Design a protein around this ligand. Sequence first.
Ligand code: FMN
Ligand code: FMN
Ligand code: FMN
Ligand code: FMN
Ligand code: 9O0
Ligand code: 9O0
Ligand code: 9O0
Ligand code: 9O0
Lengths: 332, 332, 332, 332
Amino acid sequence: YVSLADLERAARDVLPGEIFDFLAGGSGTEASLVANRTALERVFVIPRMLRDLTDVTTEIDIFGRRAALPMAVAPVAYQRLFHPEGELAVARAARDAGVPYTICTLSSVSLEEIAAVGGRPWFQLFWLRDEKRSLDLVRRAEDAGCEAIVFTVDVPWMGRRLRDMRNGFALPEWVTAANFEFAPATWESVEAVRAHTDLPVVLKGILAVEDARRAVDAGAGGIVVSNHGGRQLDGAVPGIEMLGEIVAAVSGGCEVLVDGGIRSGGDVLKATALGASAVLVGRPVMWALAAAGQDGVRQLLELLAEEVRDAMGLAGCESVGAARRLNTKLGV
Amino acid sequence: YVSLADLERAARDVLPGEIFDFLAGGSGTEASLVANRTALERVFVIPRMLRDLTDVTTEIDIFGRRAALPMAVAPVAYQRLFHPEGELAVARAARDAGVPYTICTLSSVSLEEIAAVGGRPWFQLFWLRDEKRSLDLVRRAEDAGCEAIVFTVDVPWMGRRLRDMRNGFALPEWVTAANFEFAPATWESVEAVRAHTDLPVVLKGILAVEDARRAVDAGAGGIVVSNHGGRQLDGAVPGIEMLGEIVAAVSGGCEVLVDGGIRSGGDVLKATALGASAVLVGRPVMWALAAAGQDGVRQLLELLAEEVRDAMGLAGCESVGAARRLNTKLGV
Amino acid sequence: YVSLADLERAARDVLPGEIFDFLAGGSGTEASLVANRTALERVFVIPRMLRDLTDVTTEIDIFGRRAALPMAVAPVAYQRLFHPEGELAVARAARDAGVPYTICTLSSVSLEEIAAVGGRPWFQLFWLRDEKRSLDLVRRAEDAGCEAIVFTVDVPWMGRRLRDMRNGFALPEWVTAANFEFAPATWESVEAVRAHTDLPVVLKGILAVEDARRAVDAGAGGIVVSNHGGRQLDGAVPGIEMLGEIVAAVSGGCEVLVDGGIRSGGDVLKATALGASAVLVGRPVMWALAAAGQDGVRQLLELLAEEVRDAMGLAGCESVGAARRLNTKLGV
Amino acid sequence: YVSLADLERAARDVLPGEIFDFLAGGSGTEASLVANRTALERVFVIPRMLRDLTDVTTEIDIFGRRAALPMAVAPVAYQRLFHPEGELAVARAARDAGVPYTICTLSSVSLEEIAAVGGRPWFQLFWLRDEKRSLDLVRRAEDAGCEAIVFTVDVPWMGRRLRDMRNGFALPEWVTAANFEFAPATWESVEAVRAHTDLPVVLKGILAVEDARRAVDAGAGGIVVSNHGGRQLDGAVPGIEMLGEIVAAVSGGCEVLVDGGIRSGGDVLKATALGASAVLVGRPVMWALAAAGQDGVRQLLELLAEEVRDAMGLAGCESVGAARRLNTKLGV
Ligand SMILES: Cc1cc2nc3c(=O)[nH]c(=O)nc-3n(C[C@H](O)[C@H](O)[C@H](O)COP(=O)(O)O)c2cc1C
Ligand SMILES: Cc1cc2nc3c(=O)[nH]c(=O)nc-3n(C[C@H](O)[C@H](O)[C@H](O)COP(=O)(O)O)c2cc1C
Ligand SMILES: Cc1cc2nc3c(=O)[nH]c(=O)nc-3n(C[C@H](O)[C@H](O)[C@H](O)COP(=O)(O)O)c2cc1C
Ligand SMILES: Cc1cc2nc3c(=O)[nH]c(=O)nc-3n(C[C@H](O)[C@H](O)[C@H](O)COP(=O)(O)O)c2cc1C
Ligand SMILES: O=C(O)[C@@H](O)C(F)(F)F
Ligand SMILES: O=C(O)[C@@H](O)C(F)(F)F
Ligand SMILES: O=C(O)[C@@H](O)C(F)(F)F
Ligand SMILES: O=C(O)[C@@H](O)C(F)(F)F
């Protein structure tokens, strides 16, 4: 595989159409899904030349741990849909690559089993009608050694997934929510989580500048600037279009991650040049899992690491910090 | 039907080609028709997160009545072209949905019959060569319980409808103007109408900012920012491109509606975020009428209501007022 | 014929391919040719409503004569290529429509014969290696009753017409330059012409603002803002993109015409709203001549007059002056 | 051949697919490759009229020598891939046209043999792991009569060429690096070269404004504003998009060349109007070499010279200096 796009072709060959559509699809007309890609394609980097590249490093420190790349595996529900080893296959590959893996509230293997794989696991939280269940998940995650709580704030309820409605998609009987209904979360919910854990709380799905600022004021350790991969509000701005403004507004008060459409090391470099601390990658990780299980995810992460290192050095950056100081230009 | 676009396919299957073209078409090269869609597609919403959504309401108060959604059925001439029940089928579905229905001067069922259906009917006025006939229509509408007069100001004469000219389109003998020639209207005409009724006068087809201001000064209760669905001046700016500027200029002095190309609850949300009080929807209502009569219109209005509620809540808006405070970003 | 585009189809059916290509083609990659159209398509008009339209008039006064529309027939060489009656067919139709016709230096019927048709003829001048020949043409034109000299300033030599080179195009033996080598013209040439005639001198092919200003200072009575229909410099800006700036800079000091890609009454309205005094129309007139001779040109001019009147009134303009006061908005 | 695009078709017919792909391809998704073209296509020139064109000259003085056009042949590795005469065929045609030819460090004929052809040769330098080898190349180039050292600064290592990876491309046994591993170059390397030669040092692959300024401060005699034809960082801005800003920042302190996508005399004119001293042309020269050897390159250079002269005069420029004073407008 020489690009992330070779894996999409392979995943489409193997998965049942309705599962491929659950993975690929977005809400509504899929305008936000498409715009995630368009928005990245319009960003060009202004590389620097003739800098010292004797020891290029792609590592970052985030949430108190060193990561091998400025990237983590995004939360994706129900990974046994894609391969029988599901979350364990992905978590193992992420561990071996030194990349954080986000364990989902809707994981198809229990969070404690996935955490036992090792590595840098984070835990993604959905707020539930029964509040106590959400807070018990947080405590379970912490007890299992998760290192951050990624609170998803953009799903008061699931968006309108027309592919899924047209297909009549439902989980097969062999895939369940192994940790066991959505309730709208509020800033009060954020505070209840912050009070119940010593782990950094990361709010995922922030797009308004004033929500980024309020996240810092609320004691968040990070945010993920994100439109949920075009799966929630159809017509929501891409995160990459808000990122620069958000990074300026928080002025270092929390980590600022971005996601949506990251498909190469070059895209990682764009995100960092716009100011991101790190990116999340969702669909491509699942393409690799579908295509070739743990080995497939390993191969994807190896390719991404090579592309990140290549892009960084070609742009004159010996570190991710230097990459954040790059300028960009919008084009056609 | 899971989107408004499923109904277009169904209407195209059933209607005679020349009737489908009377409905779908615009003037000239159809540049303004296409631009209505392009203009909406370029607008992205910046949603807010973590707000209280315990009681999301899509209702608005407009022209002294509560409406279920920030939407009304646009005036569309000759609805018996599309289904034998014509305007009565649409008006009944609108009533049942709590949406205002605009009875047309060129209705194929008499305005008094349509008004007898009940609901929130408005009445659309064309100025006629015989002035007295226009003013008699106003009095008839008021006597029948219509709640606003929507004075169409963008049709001094009908535009050049090339599909209709190529098809040699004419009304079948079984479709007539049941209320019974266009004369250019002026500001004097507006004043003659205002003096002849106690109902709110709404000027439909305003696109220049200074015409919006003058509408307020003239005593209008509302305007509809509109290029008549691309059917009048070919090359007229889309209403959605003028809306923000217009809303700022009138600074709350009248209701500011918009139309043209509204095809989802997401589009309704864009219009409100740009400042609209409400939208009109034309062609999609007729697609539903063609496809399945009253039931079809009911299904469309149910789908739109679900999409509006979904979009609002995903954007952190418990009310339409909150949606008007959302920011937007233009994209690709 | 219900649009100018119906005539292109008809002309393409009848003309030999190499003649159609001589007519349609531009220089180089035809980037400027295509951009003439793109540039007009991006301009939207902001129409005004509720104005008096009791006596809409499309007339203008230009170069001391009343014209029926704000349009003239552009200079096009060798019109016997397109129809056996050539320039006489076009000139007769223009006369009957009350539109000025520009007689070309490279006319395939002598300028005196065309002028004898009557009407409002103008004369287009090429500067020649033998200066005296150019100045004799001017005197001949004036003696024959031409009312303006349109000095073409953008053809120091003919551009690179790749269609013509690929086709090996040459004039058939039955088409000649009936008035009988290009020399670069300079401001000195302009002055020599101005001194040799009492007619208004119009400089055709101006695109830089400072050249427009200098034209006024040089005593020009008009300019034509133009990239020669994309036939000269490939990559020259469209005239329509320079027009507003030019109109502001000359601040009424001469008439400012535009050409390139005008294909409807709506396009005429755009040009006027951008500030043009009038437009020239080239290729469409020749399509009509190819399709149906004098009658074809008459039909085209009738259609254009109807479209201009329609566009004007739909935009709230009772006169061309009012149309010049319209605002525009650039779109997608 | 009447355009540079006729030669691409001819080269694609004759070359083995993998060699055509080595030539045509870029890094990654080829976003930067495509953007080089897009960026030029959006630039329109504002031509001037009515200037003296009695003695139009396309000559420039650069690096102490007169060149026939504001263009040089870009460094392209391994030209025996394209034709058996390789670099000697191209160098001979360049000499005969009065265009500088850049001899490559990776030339498939030795630099001394190519320099013996005569003409204006420049020498392109790669910095090597063994520094002394790079500096020996510089001395060899100077001893052989090369007139400038073009130090390539954008290849700390070769980019990710996915066409080449998919094809399993490798040099055939009959093509070698005849002058005989990449090491990242730094500003220290630049200074080591500057100290080892009296020739002008030209830094090729500059895109950041501050790197342009530093190049001047470092004693460079020129820079080439360039993204290496889209072959290095995928997502690097096109040079043509940085050029104006760069030209302003150096304010005449060194020659500022540009490359990437130059495919006509019209494109040369755009580059000069944006401020370039001269352009480099890569792929088209190799298309001509593949198609017809020395004669093919001669024909290409003749066509380019004709197009440059044509564009200049149509734009009212009797000299390249005048062309640099032209204004431009971005379009669609
Ligand atoms: C199939 C699928 C399931 C997902 N499930 C979740 C989830 O349970 N929680 C969450 O916060 N995000 C979820 N996401 C969103 C991703 O975390 C991420 O925001 C999105 O996929 C990023 O875009 P990318 O897929 O373009 O890389 C899901 C995304 C996909 C494609
Ligand atoms: C077939 C048809 C007939 C119409 N008749 C009228 C009319 O009689 N009066 C009027 O004010 N608008 C009329 N309109 C315009 C609509 O009220 C509305 O401005 C336009 O359809 C809105 O755009 P939409 O169809 O894209 O939703 C008509 C539109 C269509 C498509
Ligand atoms: C076939 C052809 C021949 C032309 N000959 C002349 C000419 O002799 N003199 C001149 O000033 N313009 C000439 N023009 C340019 C036109 O006057 C005009 O600038 C151009 O056609 C306007 O664009 P349009 O064809 O898009 O309407 C010619 C154009 C065409 C298409
Ligand atoms: C096949 C190929 C090989 C190249 N080899 C070199 C090289 O050895 N050194 C270098 O500085 N540039 C090299 N370049 C880049 C060119 O010098 C130039 O920057 C690029 O081709 C310019 O773009 P153009 O090909 O679009 O005209 C190469 C380009 C191509 C296409
Ligand atoms: O995007 C998803 O599918 C998840 O976030 C879910 F299942 F929660 F909506
Ligand atoms: O758009 C329409 O068809 C109506 O507004 C009419 F019939 F009046 F022009
Ligand atoms: O555009 C044209 O063909 C004319 O202007 C000519 F023939 F002069 F170049
Ligand atoms: O672009 C190229 O192929 C050259 O610059 C090389 F071979 F050095 F990378």
